Design a protein around this ligand. Structure first.
Ligand code: E64
Length: 212
């Protein structure tokens, strides 16, 4: 795998989004991986519905948090609608996937990256955007403005995001806190420290969709 990966340069990453006050990051994270794998497999970049996963993933807890894996499993089981068809409302409502017509995309399955292994995650990122989790509760992370972020941060993960690239000393992360946070909505998080957890627990729980 190469020294640098940046799926934005490959046209596989949609504009940065803002989840608002709702604890829906798990759905945003899942959607970035779906947008990426559909572009990789089909050549088209489309935006998908975070709101649909928020409403319809019965394993997750709406705006009270949830599971990227469960959201990805829903897309493999059933499918997902375009964002335009099922736009983001920032509040969990009744699942409306039966009343929105046929699904726009469908995946084949969901695979977990071997946890607590930076190279395994880099290998995954070299193939496609990956859903990852990190500790975002620290003000150091909350106030991040740019550069390669080293912390301070612990490994009490609480926030799902998406890894869309990497370089020799960082992993490139698409956050869901709007374009005014970080580097136009992104953070570069230091890698190569030899911590198994990853900086801010970044290697704790990583999933990606499979699409034949
Ligand atoms: C993300 C956010 O917008 O803050 C959101 O809180 C979330 O997805 N949290 C996850 C933490 C990481 C993705 C690991 C989470 O805590 N999920 C667990 C489900 C919520 C807890 N239980 C209940 N019953 N609500």
């Amino acid at each position: 795998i190469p020294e640098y990966v940046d799926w934005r340069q490959k046209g596989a990453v949609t504009p940065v989004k803002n989840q608002g006050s709702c604890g829906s990051c798990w759905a945003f994270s899942a959607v970035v991986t779906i947008e990426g794998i559909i572009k990789i497999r089909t050549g088209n970049l489309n935006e998908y519905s975070e709101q649909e996963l928020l409403d319809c993933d019965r394993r997750s807890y709406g705006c009270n948090g949830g599971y990227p894996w469960s959201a990805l499993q829903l897309v493999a089981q059933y499918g997902i609608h375009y964002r335009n068809t099922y736009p983001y409302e920032g509040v969990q409502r009744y699942c409306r996937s039966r009343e929105k017509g046929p699904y726009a995309a469908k995946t084949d399955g969901v695979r977990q990256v071997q946890p607590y292994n930076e190279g395994a995650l880099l290998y995954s990122i070299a193939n496609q955007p990956v859903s990852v989790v990190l500790e975002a509760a620290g003000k150091d992370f909350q106030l991040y403005r740019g550069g390669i972020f080293v912390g301070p941060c612990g490994n009490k993960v609480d926030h799902a995001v998406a890894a869309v690239g990497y370089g020799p000393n960082y992993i490139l992360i698409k956050n869901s806190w709007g374009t005014g946070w970080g580097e136009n909505g992104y953070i570069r998080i230091k890698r190569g420290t030899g911590n198994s957890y990853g900086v801010c627990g970044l290697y704790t729980s990583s999933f990606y969709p499979v699409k034949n």
